[PDB]
Design an enzyme around this catalytic site. Structure first.
Site, PDB file in Angstrom:
ATOM      1  N   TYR A 163       0.851  -1.189   0.000  1.00 20.41           N
ATOM      2  CA  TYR A 163       0.000   0.000   0.000  1.00 20.41           C
ATOM      3  C   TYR A 163       0.888   1.241   0.000  1.00 20.41           C
ATOM      4  O   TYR A 163       1.696   1.433   0.914  1.00 20.41           O
ATOM      5  CB  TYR A 163      -0.888   0.052   1.245  1.00 20.41           C
ATOM      6  CG  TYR A 163      -1.861  -1.095   1.399  1.00 20.41           C
ATOM      7  CD1 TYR A 163      -1.410  -2.379   1.696  1.00 20.41           C
ATOM      8  CD2 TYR A 163      -3.242  -0.891   1.274  1.00 20.41           C
ATOM      9  CE1 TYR A 163      -2.305  -3.433   1.871  1.00 20.41           C
ATOM     10  CE2 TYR A 163      -4.141  -1.944   1.446  1.00 20.41           C
ATOM     11  CZ  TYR A 163      -3.661  -3.210   1.744  1.00 20.41           C
ATOM     12  OH  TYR A 163      -4.530  -4.263   1.919  1.00 20.41           O
ATOM     13  N   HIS A 185      -7.016  -0.129  -1.525  1.00 25.20           N
ATOM     14  CA  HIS A 185      -6.479  -1.336  -2.139  1.00 25.20           C
ATOM     15  C   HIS A 185      -4.997  -1.207  -2.441  1.00 25.20           C
ATOM     16  O   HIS A 185      -4.543  -0.184  -2.943  1.00 25.20           O
ATOM     17  CB  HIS A 185      -7.262  -1.646  -3.413  1.00 25.20           C
ATOM     18  CG  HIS A 185      -8.747  -1.615  -3.217  1.00 25.20           C
ATOM     19  ND1 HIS A 185      -9.413  -2.539  -2.439  1.00 25.20           N
ATOM     20  CD2 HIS A 185      -9.684  -0.736  -3.642  1.00 25.20           C
ATOM     21  CE1 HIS A 185     -10.696  -2.228  -2.392  1.00 25.20           C
ATOM     22  NE2 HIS A 185     -10.887  -1.138  -3.114  1.00 25.20           N
ATOM     23  N   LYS A 232      -3.677  -4.638 -10.007  1.00 24.41           N
ATOM     24  CA  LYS A 232      -2.447  -4.378  -9.277  1.00 24.41           C
ATOM     25  C   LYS A 232      -1.277  -4.631 -10.220  1.00 24.41           C
ATOM     26  O   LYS A 232      -1.429  -5.285 -11.251  1.00 24.41           O
ATOM     27  CB  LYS A 232      -2.342  -5.283  -8.045  1.00 24.41           C
ATOM     28  CG  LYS A 232      -3.391  -5.007  -6.973  1.00 24.41           C
ATOM     29  CD  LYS A 232      -3.083  -5.786  -5.703  1.00 24.41           C
ATOM     30  CE  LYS A 232      -4.272  -5.868  -4.748  1.00 24.41           C
ATOM     31  NZ  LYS A 232      -4.737  -4.562  -4.215  1.00 24.41           N
TER      32      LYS A 232
END
Lengths: 289, 288
Positions: A229, A236, A265
């Site tokens: 993070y 997220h 991601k």
């Protein structure tokens, strides 16, 4: 018909076309004593276009066998796009116009790869086509994570009970998860707070992520060491980091990329290269098709 | 007041009665002007701040005999209001007057076998990850039923350029169009080639197709197959993987995370007692 030769295979040009016609339209091959000369790729390419035929019936499969499906497709695709392709020593070169020739390397699942190949990368892209004929292009780039969290040095004792590790209830807000006044910790968390940053390579990279303002949480659910993070209110994790074993196969890297992609991601691969923790992001490209 | 649990003495807090605890947290029982609790119940109350330990090494010892994973399972169900009996890592519980339920605590690194998913009469599988996150699973043997018209098929297979190819007029969904040919997968080559017994995964492939499903690569999802049930589904309902040796628990956990992630159901296949059988593993959310 007019003819030519590929390596040692004779081919005739169909529909009464001229050799200069082929060269003009497909931009490949050069004239040599009335014979149009083409390399395997160009040869297979023209054949599949139904523009040439082989004298010897076994020339087609021989070219394909030697030239591989995997590499051929990478070539065909590029041509059918516009670039001009030229192979040399396992790599494929292609320039959209009279400009910079990008490098490309076809990778196979069984292919082996080290982190160093991602760093000393005289290659701009990586190509792959699955057992379904589905092609994919990845780009390699070093990242230098820039977390935004307010980092502090944390040095604390770790209690081991119930088969798990714990820290005090007043540790840096994000480390571990609260549990009846304690802090349930992951092994990496336990090693990090107790100042054992060199227990291994994952511990060193774990430490580095935090050192640069990153909230690091486990990524074990996704097959990676941790999920990172960059912010405290970043609902997220924007990264999935995986520490790279001195050696491994390409499918682990290709898989990590899909996994990361399915949950919006970026798949990051870290390691200790020349005495430093460095990161490399592998991302699919959509502007090369 | 007095009480013993796991051989460790404990005293009630806020000068409460041994029977006050029972009535409220409905656990343990009276023995002889002494309250009796099992390890889980003792720790459960300790953390509640309703009891204390005569000793000072009891808590830790208590938390060591009982593991973290198993305690959390117990604590969660207890807080949910259920009645819980924590045997050897095997948890039995009931919500109100409903029928009792089984719950096995599974460690991410546990060794799981297909034979287990089928034979095991346990209702649910419990896991608490390294981040304290608990997750419940349930396995159900399934029998895939597709609505696709199946047709026998045994055409020749050409092998060139490192891949396998078939005629460009084979079943519309098999392989992939490639300059008149049909790029095939290792499984498709064996299928049309009549080598359905090539390996276990080839047998389930064949069984899958034999039961009207349009099978394709599960590759993108880290799985053997992607299975469509309808004559024209846009997305494969199932994800099917054939379970290896050598098979740790985190594999299944990963698979379920993957499947859920894409709207699909994670299914594990295998040749059990000389028959291809399937078991769907799902995440359970109407408990805890």
């Amino acid at each position: 018909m007019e003819q030519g030769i590929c390596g040692s295979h004779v081919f005739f040009i169909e529909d009464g076309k001229s050799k200069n016609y082929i060269i003009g339209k497909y931009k490949i091959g050069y004239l040599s004593g009335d014979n149009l000369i083409l390399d395997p790729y160009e040869c297979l390419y023209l054949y599949f276009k139904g523009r040439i035929s082989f004298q010897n019936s076994d020339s087609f499969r021989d070219l394909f066998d030697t030239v591989t499906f995997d590499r051929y497709v990478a070539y065909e695709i590029l041509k059918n796009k516009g670039y001009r392709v030229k192979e040399d020593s396992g790599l494929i070169y292609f320039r959209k116009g009279t400009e910079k020739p990008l490098s490309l390397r076809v990778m196979r699942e069984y292919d082996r790869i080290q982190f160093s190949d991602l760093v000393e990368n005289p290659v701009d892209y990586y190509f792959t086509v699955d057992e379904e004929g589905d092609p994919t292009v990845y780009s390699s780039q070093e990242i230098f994570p820039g977390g935004r969290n307010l980092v502090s040095p944390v040095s604390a004792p770790v209690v081991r009970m119930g088969g798990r590790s714990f820290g005090a209830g007043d540790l840096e807000w994000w480390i571990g998860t609260a549990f009846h006044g304690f802090r349930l910790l992951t092994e990496n968390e336990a090693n990090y707070i107790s100042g054992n940053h060199s227990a291994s390579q994952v511990d060193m990279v774990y430490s580095d992520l935090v050192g640069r303002g990153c909230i690091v949480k486990t990524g074990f659910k996704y097959g990676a060491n941790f999920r990172v993070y960059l912010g405290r209110d970043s609902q997220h994790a924007e990264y999935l980091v995986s520490v790279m074993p001195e050696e491994e196969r390409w499918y682990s890297i290709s898989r990590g990329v899909r996994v990361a992609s399915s949950v919006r991601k970026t798949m990051i691969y870290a390691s200790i290269y020349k005495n430093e923790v460095r990161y490399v992001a592998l991302k699919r490209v959509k502007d090369i098709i």
